[PDB]
């Protein structure tokens, strides 16, 4: 149940990852993904390749962002691997100076939150407003401004069972939130000094954490302009934190009007209560836990040195700890990738560290995860 937030008021290089939803077997139907993450602003040209030819009929996920407001997308397509077929992802972004090509080298509590993105398009019509509602790491609604008939549209196998009353009120809010955000972007060109020739962003987020006690643990209501913190709701659910001078101008305006009062009522009330329902309706998937499947692979770059890689596959929830240790700890001199979404609700990740060939049996990787009952440890052993 969305909340009707009726109150008006950096550039990161993408991290392109091309991988396969499952280990690649020649001739076996497999999914190819191009998960670009950690980029900002939102605009990005992503296109999956196959032997230099662009692939059509690819599928991509709804725009979201992490805690630091950096965006991420999952471009994937159904394919079948072979020996000859080489696959690349052609990602282009403003930070890059030429399109980046990444070849598919085979060897390479709870919380309901509502992310919204409003990207102004000064000459391409009304602002591109896209909003997504999550539960823990799972997605369960979306509402795109540019859809044929903009409507709160389910994205989970347990949410579509809601009745019309659910979708009519949620749709009403989103079409109100879009018009609220649209006003915000117009005024932010005024607070700052910005020409009407550039496209900007206004990300907003809110939600309700809920510890095991079934009561609100910390409410969220944040805002970002152009990819940086703008104004946030403090844990007390009564004050505001302004991250810059312009955020102070608006911070007073939301203290006199006591907008936080409505947020607390929903955050402490309607927000958590529905989260409990979503957990009760979707208890099949949200409350699940799949332990990672772990395998360690070694490929040498020399006759006496090599890079050792520990793989974690098919686990949910996303949060996982995975790092390398010698004799049982290498926080530095280690390479660790962003957690990868497999596109089926599960995630993947790996970590690598260089090693001299000898005494590799001393090394080990340790896997800690919510779904894991006991700590884990493994080392390469052909």
């Amino acid at each position: 149940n969305r909340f009707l937030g009726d109150y008006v008021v950096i550039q990161r290089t993408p991290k392109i990852q091309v991988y396969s939803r499952h280990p690649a077997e020649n001739g076996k139907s497999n999914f190819l993904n191009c998960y670009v993450s950690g980029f900002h602003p939102s605009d990005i040209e992503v296109d999956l390749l196959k032997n230099g030819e662009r692939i059509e009929k690819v599928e991509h996920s709804d725009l979201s962002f992490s805690k630091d407001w950096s965006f991420y997308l999952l471009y994937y397509t159904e394919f079948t691997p072979t020996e000859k077929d080489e696959y690349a992802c052609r990602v282009n972004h403003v930070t890059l100076s030429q399109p980046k090509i990444v070849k598919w080298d085979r060897d390479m509590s709870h919380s309901m939150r509502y992310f919204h993105t409003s990207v102004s398009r000064p000459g391409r019509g009304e602002p591109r407003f896209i909003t997504v509602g999550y539960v823990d790491d799972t997605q369960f609604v979306r509402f795109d401004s540019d859809a044929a008939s903009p409507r709160e549209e389910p994205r989970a196998p347990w949410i579509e069972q809601e009745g019309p009353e659910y979708w009519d009120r949620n749709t009403q809010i989103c079409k109100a939130k879009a018009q609220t955000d649209r006003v915000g972007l117009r005024n932010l060109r005024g607070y700052y000094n910005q020409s009407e020739d550039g496209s900007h962003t206004w990300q907003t987020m809110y939600g309700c954490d809920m510890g095991p006690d079934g009561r609100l643990l910390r409410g969220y209501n944040q805002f970002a302009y152009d990819g940086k913190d703008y104004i946030a709701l403090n844990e007390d659910l009564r004050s505001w934190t302004a991250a810059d001078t312009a955020a102070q101008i608006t911070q007073r305006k939301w203290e006199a009007a006591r907008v936080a009062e409505q947020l607390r009522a929903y955050l402490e009330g309607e927000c958590v209560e529905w989260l409990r329902r979503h957990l009760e309706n979707g208890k099949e998937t949200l409350q699940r836990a799949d332990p990672p499947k772990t395998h360690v692979t070694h490929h040498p770059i020399s006759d006496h040195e090599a890079t050792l890689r520990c793989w974690a596959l098919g686990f949910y929830p996303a949060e996982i700890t995975l790092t390398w240790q010698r004799d049982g700890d290498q926080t530095q001199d280690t390479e660790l990738v962003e957690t990868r979404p497999a596109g089926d609700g599960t995630f993947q990740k790996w970590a690598a560290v260089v090693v001299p060939s000898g005494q590799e049996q001393r090394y080990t990787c340790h896997v800690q995860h919510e779904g894991l009952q006991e700590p884990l440890t493994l080392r390469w052993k052909p």
Partner: antibody
Amino acid sequence: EVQLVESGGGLVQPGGSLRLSCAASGFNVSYYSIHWVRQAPGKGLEWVASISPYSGSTSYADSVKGRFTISADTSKNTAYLQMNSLRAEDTAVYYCARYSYGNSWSYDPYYGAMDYWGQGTLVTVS
Amino acid sequence: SDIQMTQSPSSLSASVGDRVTITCRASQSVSSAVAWYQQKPGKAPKLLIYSASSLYSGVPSRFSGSRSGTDFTLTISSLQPEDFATYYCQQYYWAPITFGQGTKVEI
């Protein structure tokens, strides 16, 4: 109103060096990657180099790689091109180009557009 | 290997109002990342089409592009006296950016 102005042109002896300037106006260059293209007299258009001003990542065409150093300044809101070890063939009216990146998460995936070219400025190697 | 844009004809004369098409081919499978530029004498190129099909904002509606395989066609539906210029193909899909040798139209 978006409009770019180029400067730094004139004459130069072969083997010399010149520093071209393309001062943007009407938009923050940090939102775009400024590409440099040259046209020999009555010939095709050749791409020179490109600067992503915010991250300063740059790429150079092999025809000038190792001789040309490109640069930008967000605070000044201008684009600079350093040319050294000049060759006779480098005569052209140099245009600075404004790449405008697109997106694919739209329902109709786009591609960027080199929408705005500068007026050009002649540079004679002689 | 640089991606040459084989553009033909080197020139072609058409009467005012005529329907004209300009072909352009890439040495590999360049995708719809192709744009068309108009260069009047002693002037900087001006964008006409991008994404290989989309009319650029403000450009006359008669101008249009279409991609079929790796062959790109720039269409004049009704030539006007202001369409005299050395038109150019281009490919920004692959680095480096390259342009076709040009197409001189005489009126």
